[PDB]
Amino acid sequence: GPEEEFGMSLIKHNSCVITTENGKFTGLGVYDRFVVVPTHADPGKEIQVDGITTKVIDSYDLYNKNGIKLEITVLKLDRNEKFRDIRRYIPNNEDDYPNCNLALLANQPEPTIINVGDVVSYGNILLSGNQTARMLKYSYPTKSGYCGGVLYKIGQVLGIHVGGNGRDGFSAMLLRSYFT
Numbered sequence: 001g002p003e004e005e006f007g008m009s010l011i012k013h014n015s016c017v018i019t020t021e022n023g024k025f026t027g028l029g030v031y032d033r034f035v036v037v038p039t040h041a042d043p044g045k046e047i048q049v050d051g052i053t054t055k056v057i058d059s060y061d062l063y064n065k066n067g068i069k070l071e072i073t074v075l076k077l078d079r080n081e082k083f084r085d086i087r088r089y090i091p092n093n094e095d096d097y098p099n100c101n102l103a104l105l106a107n108q109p110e111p112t113i114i115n116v117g118d119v120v121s122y123g124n125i126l127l128s129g130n131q132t133a134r135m136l137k138y139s140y141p142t143k144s145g146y147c148g149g150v151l152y153k154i155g156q157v158l159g160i161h162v163g164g165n166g167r168d169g170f171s172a173m174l175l176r177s178y179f180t
């Protein structure tokens with residue numbers, strides 16, 4: 001169906017594998033040379049993008065107005081390739097979303113789409129004891145290797161996967177104002 005194809009097109013055109021010293025993560029290319037990754041990926045001066053050593057020109061760890069981490073890190077990459085602009089799919093406000101999917105690349109044998117079900121704007125949680133804001137929660141047993149996975153519905157790019165406890169999974173919310 002179109003929602004599955006939209007997800008496969010996000011993988012094909014707007015995803016990459018980001019390797020840092022903390023492991024491999026699914027990276028979302030937002031536009032131009034800007035890619036997002038979970039903050040806990042801890043990208044250094046150089047990362048790998050699909051195995052290619054790439055200098056990071058600038059890195060921006062995003063925080064809310066109270067100085068709480070959003071678990072979104074924006075990276076400007078020193079590479080020739082430009083990502084298709086997907087900002088128009090990113091919502092302007094916090095909300096709930098029924099029947100969402102996660103598009104996974106890193107740590108998978110091939111591009112994978114997981115149907116995670118209904119998503120709710122969940123507020124702040126503690127991820128390994130650290131307060132993290134603007135969480136999107138789903139009742140799906142997400143696992144190790146899923147981080148950076150892209151939360152989406154047809155025509156909507158909603159978040160990036162950051163954590164879970166074996167029952168629930170959590171994404172850092174993507175808001176359009178972060179990138180405009």
Ligand SMILES: *[C@@H](CC(=O)OCC)[C@H](C[C@@H]1CCNC1=O)NC(=O)[C@@H]1[C@@H](c2ccccc2)CCN1C(=O)[C@@H](NC(=O)c1cc(C)on1)C(C)C
Pocket residue numbers: 022023024025040071125126127128129130141142143144145146147148161162163164165166169170
């Ligand atoms: C993704 C990390 C990844 O793929 O790295 C590749 C090298 C995982 C996903 C997680 C693992 C188990 N199920 C999942 O969905 N993320 C983590 O392991 C995160 C990570 C972290 C993220 C942000 C800030 C600090 C640390 C390390 C801890 N973590 C977790 O998900 C923990 N869960 C919680 O703390 C938690 C809190 C709540 C309300 O639910 N879960 C796990 C205990 C490891």
